[PDB]
From a paper:
The intracellular bacterial pathogen [name] modulates host cell functions by secreting multiple effectors with diverse biochemical activities. In particular, effectors of the SidE family interfere with host protein ubiquitination in a process that involves production of phosphoribosyl ubiquitin (PR-Ub). Here, we show that effector LnaB converts PR-Ub into ADP-ribosylated ubiquitin, which is further processed to ADP-ribose and functional ubiquitin by the (ADP-ribosyl)hydrolase [name], thus maintaining ubiquitin homeostasis in infected cells. The activity of LnaB requires a motif consisting of Ser, His and Glu (SHxxxE) present in a large family of toxins from diverse bacterial pathogens.
To understand the catalytic mechanism of the ADP-ribosylhydrolase (ARH) activity of [name], we screened its active truncation mutants and succeeded in solving the structure of the MavL40-404-[name] complex at a resolution of 2.38 Å, which revealed that several pairs of hydrogen bonds and a π-π stacking interaction provided by surrounding amino acids or water molecules are involved in interactions between [name] and [name]. The negatively charged residues D315, D323, and D333 likely form a catalytic loop (β8-α8) that directly interacts with the hydroxyl groups of ribose by hydrogen bonding. Mutational analysis indicated that all three residues are critical for the ARH activity of [name] against [name]-Ub. Indeed, recombinant [name] effectively hydrolyzed [name]-Ub into [name] and ubiquitin, which is in contrast to DupA and DupB. In addition, we observed four water molecules around the [name] moiety, two of which (H2O-1 and H2O-2) are also found in other macro domain ARHs. These two water molecules form a hydrogen bond network with the α-phosphate of [name] and the O1” site of the distal ribose group, wherein the α-phosphate activates H2O-1 to initiate a nucleophilic attack on the O1” glycosidic bond, leading to its cleavage (middle).
Residue numbers in the entry: 42 to 369, 373 to 404
Write the structure that this text describes.
Amino acid sequence: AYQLLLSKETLNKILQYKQNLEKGLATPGKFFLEELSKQEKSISEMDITTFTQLLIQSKKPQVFAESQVYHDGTDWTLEEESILGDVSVNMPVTMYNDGGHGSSFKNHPKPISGYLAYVPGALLASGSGPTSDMKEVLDNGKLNQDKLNALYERRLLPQLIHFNELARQNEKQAAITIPGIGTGCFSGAYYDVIKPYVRNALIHILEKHKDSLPYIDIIHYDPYMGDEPAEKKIGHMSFRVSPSGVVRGTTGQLDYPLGSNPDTHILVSIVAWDHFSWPGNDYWGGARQTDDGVKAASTDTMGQVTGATGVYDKKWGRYMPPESFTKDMSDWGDYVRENGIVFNGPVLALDKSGKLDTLE
Ligand SMILES: Nc1ncnc2c1ncn2[C@@H]1O[C@H](COP(=O)(O)OP(=O)(O)OC[C@H]2O[C@H](O)[C@H](O)[C@@H]2O)[C@@H](O)[C@H]1O
């Protein structure tokens, strides 16, 4: 029902980390250790896929990565955090509204079927000393455009390759909507300077891998505000920058961009996710707030992850937990605590040749 993806570089980091845990050169963080203790095998006796799944399973339904983490053995180590930020997840979804924040959403008369790809952006904020992503892309506290290009390339390429093959298997092209990933909460002190960097990072990936993405046609980038409305042609792809608060009538994220439709294109939206949380994040707590929480609440994301069938509330634009649970603490996070649900699924990685395959 959901699929975890990662780059070649991320699998090399899992491999190194697994080796170090076997050799005694590393010790696991508190939350990864808790998930290992719920299982019988040791680090040495486990395969790389089981190891990867248990590290991903340390994610909690709700965690604010920018403010609630210490980046040490008390929660998640800088090593685990390096791996976790690179993990993305995708799932097919029924989109019930266009994704408008607050009361602005428009309900789909007939729910649209598409896909969500949850990808964490550069974590450049912290309430406890520098993050793994701050160490990588910052040179003396200044944003490095080329290091940011490398980070987003590593995170977004496994999903871009995944949806390119899916659109070829469906005989359609791809229409992908992308928000201003890493430009809000995760930008920290760089809030006033980050928007051009994320837009240039997306241009860079699509310019680099255009030969590997033929069945990808529309890229609709909506950073809400702080970017000039523009149309750019990257090879065969059309990259559009249409900030909703700048360009009135902009197509919503969970809606078909202009020049795409259900018969010619498959609809994919990127979701600005968190290193340490389950896909919905804030919406596990009932709040339809961030890009992450608005997109999970506006789709059946919670139904995909928990396996339960919820009920869409047209007035609040939220996918609510089953009536049988609530009749009796009734948000989606309490549903998972009541039923013992864990975030654990299949995981694929890009190999040397640039294709997705098993981790063993
Ligand atoms: N009313 C609005 N309507 C539409 N878009 C908005 C609005 N306000 C801001 N945006 C834009 O929505 C875009 C994304 O901003 P963010 O949601 O913070 O994403 P991140 O990657 O920085 O932080 C990830 C964390 O936030 C989640 O909790 C996750 O689970 C993580 O914890 C920005 O371009 C905004 O300008």
